[PDB]
């Protein structure tokens, strides 16, 4: 997270960390939509162009974390994956369209003051909250800067970082990239004349882009940290997976009934 802040304890109880066994390293962000399912971006598990192709056995899932590196014995919960599901039409060759993926935990997790699920939007919610000008929130443990002087500092934050970004008008997004953006994407970020900054960045991917419903006081996950061109550049914005549009697939995979 660029230009964000330290989050308060228990500020994003649905925030999940995707840990890599060996080497041990932080792979991506993610979210807890339930007692046994985690929602992340596809490109976190599969990106051929870089020979990226993880499986159920290569990763771990850490829920309830605050600190980036600590082993929070009393508060966090470490889960193992039972099965990974990547959107069948996830386009990693051109624009990362449908950059969504679900992960099924082996054993259900126990909710707590630190571990709680976020909600998924419905038609009306998505309809009224996803409007340009309205602000969303992004959270993660990724780079604090797109670039930095080696060995003189630490590109990574000590604790979970949080930033609030506004939604940008489609046309404006379309004009900022040579990339082909779909209806499965959305963009956020301040504009150059806006006098503010912030962005997600490497390591934040898979993280959730949430919004708060004034009427029901609940948080809704409207998007997923997807892609972008560097971090915090002027005249550029972050692209998030449109969670609402891909809901039917989620629905199909989950099968609660």
């Amino acid at each position: 997270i660029v230009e964000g802040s330290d989050a308060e304890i228990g500020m994003s109880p649905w925030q999940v960390m995707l840990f890599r066994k060996s080497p041990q390293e932080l792979l991506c962000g993610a979210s807890l939509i339930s007692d046994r399912w985690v929602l992340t971006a596809a490109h976190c598990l599969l990106y051929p162009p870089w020979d990226k192709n993880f499986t159920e056995n290569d990763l771990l899932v850490r829920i309830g974390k605050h600190s980036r590196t600590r082993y929070e014995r009393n508060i966090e919960k470490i889960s193992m994956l039972e099965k990974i599901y990547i959107h069948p039409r996830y386009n990693w060759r051109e624009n990362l369209d449908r950059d969504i993926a679900l992960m099924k935990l082996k054993k259900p997790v126990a909710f707590s003051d630190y571990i709680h699920p976020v909600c998924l939007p419905d038609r009306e919610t998505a309809a009224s909250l996803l409007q340009a000008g309205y602000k969303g929130r992004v959270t993660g443990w990724g780079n604090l800067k797109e670039t930095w002087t080696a060995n003189v500092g630490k590109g990574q934050p000590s604790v979970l970082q949080v930033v609030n970004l506004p939604i940008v008008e489609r046309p404006v997004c379309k004009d900022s990239t040579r990339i082909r953006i779909t209806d499965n994407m959305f963009c956020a970020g301040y504009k150059p004349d806006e006098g503010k900054r912030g962005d997600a960045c490497e390591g934040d991917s898979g993280g959730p882009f949430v919004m708060k419903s004034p009427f029901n006081n609940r948080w809704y996950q409207m998007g997923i940290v997807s892609w972008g061109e560097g971090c915090d550049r002027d005249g550029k914005y972050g692209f998030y997976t449109h969670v609402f549009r891909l809901k039917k697939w989620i629905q199909k995979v989950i099968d609660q009934f």
Partner: peptide, 29 residues
């Protein structure tokens, strides 16, 4: 059905976080 979106140390405790209002106000502009 399942409750969600309600943070146990915030919503449920009637407390709000440090920058939550920025979100909220962004609606009533």
């Amino acid at each position: 059905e399942a409750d969600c979106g309600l943070r146990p140390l915030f919503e449920k405790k009637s407390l709000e976080d440090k920058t939550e209002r920025e979100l909220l106000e962004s609606y009533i502009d």
